[PDB]
Symmetry: C2
Subunit: 181 residues, 2 copies
């Protein structure tokens, strides 16, 4: 199993810009004040690959709420880049359900509202760390197949189910985002 370099533009101190998370100027927040504007992320081409997948996870969220928080899951990435604002704009990628959802199985909403909430949250949600600055982990998977059989709404383990036995390489990369409010 091989590895590859993953990149994302941060400042000198390794911080991603305010606009990509909770501290964003209002104009980069959606109707409800949520940072939905995804950053440009890119990585080395991996020979043999035919698509890539990506998960963005906050390990520092375990302290805050008991488990790590899922910010972004994306599969069917045809090329070695996600262009800035890809989450709202890219129409070829397929996107997984993030941890703001209230459509997980043990939720008290009915089947239809679970579905509505899952699709609603099948996007990038930006950093919003309450207890202080956090590191965030981008992990990129290089796959030996062009397409994953995934339809929104799908969850992190669904990505992994369809990726299983098809991963030729993995790339990791961390960034910082300042405390929120």
């Amino acid at each position: 199993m091989k590895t590859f370099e993953v990149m994302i533009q941060t400042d000198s101190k390794g911080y991603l810009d305010a606009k990509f998370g909770g501290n964003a100027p209002k104009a980069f927040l959606n109707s409800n004040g949520l940072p939905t504007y995804s950053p440009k992320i890119s990585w080395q081409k991996v020979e043999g690959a035919q698509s890539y997948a990506l998960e963005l996870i906050d390990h520092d969220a375990q302290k805050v709420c008991g488990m790590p928080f899922v910010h972004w899951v994306v599969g069917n990435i045809a090329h070695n880049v996600l262009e800035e604002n890809a989450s709202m704009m890219d129409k070829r990628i397929v996107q997984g359900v993030n941890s703001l959802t209230q459509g997980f199985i043990r939720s008290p909403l009915n089947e239809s509202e679970k579905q509505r909430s899952n699709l609603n949250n099948s996007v990038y949600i930006g950093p919003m760390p309450p207890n202080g600055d956090h590191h965030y982990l981008i992990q990129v998977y290089a796959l030996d197949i062009p397409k994953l059989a995934l339809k929104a709404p799908f969850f992190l383990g669904d990505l992994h189910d369809k990726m299983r036995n098809h991963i030729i390489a993995i790339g990791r990369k961390e960034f910082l985002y300042k405390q929120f409010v």
Copy 2:
């Protein structure tokens, strides 16, 4: 940045034995019914590694409750192996808070109760998947320093803070565990 192989004894079908997750015979549970009996996990020795660390996560939990679930967090592993029952028996390792904890910030519990909960749950908690069989992911880190500066209670994020810039290799292994019913 290198990778290395990680091993765990499984079924011909890829399932870890019941005893490790609370379909377990009651002899392998604690007095409260919890699967705290950790499986033997080992991996190929890596060049330059002064210590190893491990984390065990269930991504399949995300669908169930909204987030992946942390089953086990461990640092200060001197050798390329954790022996069976290591979580209970190994004096040399340090262990992070698992996802049963109710000591996270923004739990309703008071400050002192949180500290207890965190410490009480600084152990391996085995698979208990409610909705069907789950895959679990073991991730092992090879480090270039012999000891991490970690003292229970500490979380997954803390493990990573101490390991940042010291990881010389990562190993990954998945296993299955049967749906848990009552």
